[PDB]
Amino acid sequence: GPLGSASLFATITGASKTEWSFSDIELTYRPNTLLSLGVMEFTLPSGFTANTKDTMNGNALRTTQILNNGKTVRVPLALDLLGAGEFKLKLNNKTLPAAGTYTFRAENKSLSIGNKFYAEASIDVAKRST
Amino acid sequence: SASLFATITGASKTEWSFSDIELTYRPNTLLSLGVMEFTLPSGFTANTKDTMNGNALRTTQILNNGKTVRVPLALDLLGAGEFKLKLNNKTLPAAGTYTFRAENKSFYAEASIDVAKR
Amino acid sequence: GPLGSASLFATITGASKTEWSFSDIELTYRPNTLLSLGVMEFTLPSGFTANTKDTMNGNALRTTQILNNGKTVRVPLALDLLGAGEFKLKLNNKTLPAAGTYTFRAENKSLSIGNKFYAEASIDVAKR
Amino acid sequence: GPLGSASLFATITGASKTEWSFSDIELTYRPNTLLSLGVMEFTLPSGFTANTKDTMNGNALRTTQILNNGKTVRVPLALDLLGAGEFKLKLNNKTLPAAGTYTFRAENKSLSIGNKFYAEASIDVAKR
Amino acid sequence: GPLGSASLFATITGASKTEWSFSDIELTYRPNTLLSLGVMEFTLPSGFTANTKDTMNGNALRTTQILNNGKTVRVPLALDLLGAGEFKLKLNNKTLPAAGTYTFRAENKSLSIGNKFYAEASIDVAKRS
Amino acid sequence: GPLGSASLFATITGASKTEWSFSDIELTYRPNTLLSLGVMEFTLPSGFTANTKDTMNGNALRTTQILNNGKTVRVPLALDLLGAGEFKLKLNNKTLPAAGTYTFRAENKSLSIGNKFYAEASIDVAKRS
Amino acid sequence: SASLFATITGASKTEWSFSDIELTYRPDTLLSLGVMEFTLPSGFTANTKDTMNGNALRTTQILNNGKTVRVPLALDLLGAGEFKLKLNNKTLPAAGTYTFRAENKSLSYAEASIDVAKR
Amino acid sequence: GPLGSASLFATITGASKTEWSFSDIELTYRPNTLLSLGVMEFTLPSGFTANTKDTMNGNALRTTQILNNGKTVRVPLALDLLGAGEFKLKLNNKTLPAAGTYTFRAENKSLSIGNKFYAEASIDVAKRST
Amino acid sequence: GPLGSASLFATITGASKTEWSFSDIELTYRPNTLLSLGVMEFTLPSGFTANTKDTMNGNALRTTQILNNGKTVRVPLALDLLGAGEFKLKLNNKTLPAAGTYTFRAENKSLSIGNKFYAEASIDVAKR
Amino acid sequence: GPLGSASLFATITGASKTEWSFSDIELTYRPNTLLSLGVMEFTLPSGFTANTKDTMNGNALRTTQILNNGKTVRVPLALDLLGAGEFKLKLNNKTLPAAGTYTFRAENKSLSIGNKFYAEASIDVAKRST
Ligand SMILES: [Cl-]
Ligand SMILES: [Cl-]
Ligand SMILES: [Cl-]
Ligand SMILES: [Cl-]
Ligand SMILES: [Cl-]
Ligand SMILES: [Cl-]
Ligand SMILES: [Cl-]
Ligand SMILES: [Cl-]
Ligand SMILES: [Cl-]
Ligand SMILES: [Cl-]
């Protein structure tokens, strides 16, 4: 199609970016598809999991959407029209894992028109001593 | 109103024997958006060799210690007239009456089978 | 960019607009979204109820669409695209209630790329 | 939406139109919707039922499409775009019922944009 | 394939619906066509006239849009696509005429793939006490 | 239609905001229309005029785009599709006029589907010490 | 309303001399759908060396023995702020005042004159 | 685009198909374009001309639409949307020319989306003696 | 009215087009329909096969998408609208087979308003 | 959001691909924009030129569309919507030039919501065999 690739933005929004501290992460996914009617899912790297106090576009996640022991957040019927669609997953009050770089992925897995249907983005968790 | 049919389809209906169960849910109206959910009674479980409308269950569709099977209603599933869950090669539990349930979580139905004494 | 708002029109289409007389009321709803799939719902004020002789887009309401003692009418799998979608709820052969102003609501509860805020509209029933 | 009402044509296409003789019936439904992604069903009147040798747009009906003891034929995901869609159900090698008028119905029951989503058409089975 | 019909809604939106009082009237027209480019026209019944304090889609009418002594309001280069086009004429702070039912019309006079037949809608002005 | 109102942003983007000093002004218009194929015009208030060193989306204005003695800048065929269109008029190297508030306007004047086709925005020009 | 400007733009304004004329129609509104039409008085004619907004006239655009120039308003023309007809390298006719007309013919008129000088 | 080629159907609808007799011709042109906003024109072969008693979609031709000595009938802004458009030119009460095969053409000359933007179709005018 | 047809392009995009050398092949398929939802399928000629290092629209193929011993590649839930849909199958770092002409196929097996007939395209592998 | 890019394919469609033989070449261009209206232009490499026997979307080129001594072919009022527009320039019955690789370009010079960057594609003309 006439639109660009799917995009994903990942950022630590909480005050702390340090390993083993409480913080918040926001993952903003834009399919950038002419049309989508299909499955969309976020895959979280080891160190991060979703639960029902996390939100998608401001609404609490439902257990039916959280799969693979908190690693997968799936929307079975995910709308997009001319790249207007957006899925913002907020991971609230998480204990950040060990220092290092962590990569998140989001993908439209079915029923989408576009040139590339997945995207990845990373965050850096900082060391306790610098 | 929705219907659920539950049948032991293997040759044997007797406690602790090897058999097959078939659970056929029919909403009889159209499904709305949501997640089709079967509940099996304690003594029955599903695994990834069982099937839903001819397709192997995925691990993500089974939880609650094997007693719950979920099928989120993607656009291509919404219009189905029927959801047929085949529980294959099971060891039947102790004699008694067992009630199976199915609903569209966002159209409740239930049915029972009788497992025979040896 | 910024998205538009839903609209609702509430129209007494029968010849009479007078209290305690027979008439028809038509409620025209446009959720006015880029794309929506799922539940849309009309809410009727006290004085008006829906039954299976009333219609949605020309077709008789089903029992399962009529909730909360006739005050709620649901379209469970509505579709909207570019604001072209439209739902016409026609309340047929109703005895209009006491003179006054009556407000109807229609709301978008679907999967939606759009502004889901409800729309309202009113009719005036005239005194005998 | 900008299109007209759904339409249904119903015709006895076999050489005989006489009660208790073999013939074929063709039912041509046009949803006339801006977009459809939902369920479409034909409803057959008493005296006519469908089986897996009958066809939808030339393809044999699947068992999963035939509901309510053969009275209902469903396309569970029935596409339309600006009224380009069409569903032609052919009831083949049927023994016509008693003489009289028989009314068929077809409708989009979900996920469709349009002003009227059902249509009816009838056939006359001749005496003798 | 058959095409749909245009729609017009006419509403007294101000608090008062009584003859010889001030109120506002809104006219919402959807030509409801696959594709239209060109002239669309509202026609107001005697008792109601347009001026440059009235608005089309939130913007003041130009003198050139008001014809036939305030009876006709034209959108010379309207556009419609898939029935998504909409024109809202708002008659601001008008003195309502004598009690009765008044019928407004809107017509599609454009290049069009669609049903160009006019739409109509009425309002009821109530009697003084 | 399903989009919101047209928007206009107006900002003095040069270093100076002071009356009678050199600066640049940037006017960003979003028609926010389902589809536009028509005329779009910026209207500049007294104190500002356009010439061919000014730009529309980075391109020098053509003489035929500048009307009404520099007061009006036209895009004669101004595309929009689902609000993706944008028109950025940059007024380059201008002498700001006397201190006060100045209001700019932009509008789709024809062949557009939308709910509100014009927008205004202002800038404040500061007094010299 | 709509205006028309008629001006002799070449060196000479005198009967029988070679010069240039500019006819500039400015709707002060926008154009409506229709046909842009210029009417030249006897003594002036258009040909395919003349131009409308910088484009050479086409044969189908000129009729009435070169005295009428007609441009049906296709979508790409509608938005124009002006229609400028350039009559290039012409022989000015006998001395007198000559009136040009231009209008947008629609299914829903302007004038200007030049003085050609006696030699 | 996803639609087929422009089509043109040409037929003598009058009772007589014979050379030098009065008859009527109907030319039905379908651009079959996803979208058109451009110029559309019919081209008539020598032997046939248009005038203002002829009609386009039931409306009298205007003199501004008839060009090249009655051989060209042009619409400057010709709409189509997903192939729903049609231009039916009725040539009314013409004197059929000499016996032979005559080919008509219609085309979209600008601002159209599609795979083929012109079509041709012929009619046969019969001999007075057979 | 009448519909258009699908298109397939097949291109050697690697540096070499020579038999027995390493290269990349890209197949660009447009089913070119008004609306489609469902299975689309590419078929590769003897000499070329797909594995999970090859990609569809930039994403590695899944084992379940590769069938018939590497000869068939399926997109099970493709979507098309107004001929805007496109599928790009890239065969990465393949050893080109013997000099000659090789023909690829792509077919629409979906629910479709449109011409489902397959599209073909060929590449020429050059002699050393 | 972000936009996609235009595509060009170049295909020798005649039976022969060998230098100095007669063949046909077809260039398929998709500007791939949300909305475009105006000029699109093809550029042919040395060894190929256009004339009025070549076609665009199956219709003979006009002299006014062929510029720079046959090197440039313009569509002056192209239309694109949602990446559905497509232009096919067919070079008919050409004598193929010397064996080698030949690169064609197509560019969007229109009013556009879209990425107007040019697209390129090449063909290989084969050596004659011995
Ligand atoms: Cl896309
Ligand atoms: Cl519709
Ligand atoms: Cl809009
Ligand atoms: Cl011409
Ligand atoms: Cl003279
Ligand atoms: Cl097309
Ligand atoms: Cl006629
Ligand atoms: Cl895999
Ligand atoms: Cl392509
Ligand atoms: Cl030749």
Swiss-Prot record, chain B:
This protein's UniProt keywords: Cell wall, Secreted, Signal
Subcellular location: Secreted; Secreted, Cell wall
Disruption phenotype: Overall loss in complex colony architecture and lack of fruiting body-like structures. Disruption of the gene results in the loss of surface repellency and alters the biofilm surface microstructure.
Induction note: Up-regulated by DegU and Spo0A. Repressed by AbrB.
Hydrolase among keywords: no
Cellular component aspect of the GO annotation: extracellular region
Coiled coil: none
Keyword field contains Signal: yes
Effect of L30D: Partial loss of morphological complexity. Biofilm retains nonwetting, hydrophobic nature
Oligomer and partners: Forms polymers.
Biological role stated in the UniProt entry: Involved in biofilm formation. Self-polymerizes and forms a layer on the surface of biofilms that confers hydrophobicity to the biofilm. The layer is stable and capable of resistance to high mechanical force compression. Required for complex colony architecture. May function synergistically with exopolysaccharides and TasA amyloid fibers to facilitate the assembly of the biofilm matrix.
Similarity comment text for this entry: Belongs to the BslA/BslB family.
Name of the protein in question: Biofilm-surface layer protein A
Taxonomic source organism: Bacillus subtilis (strain 168)
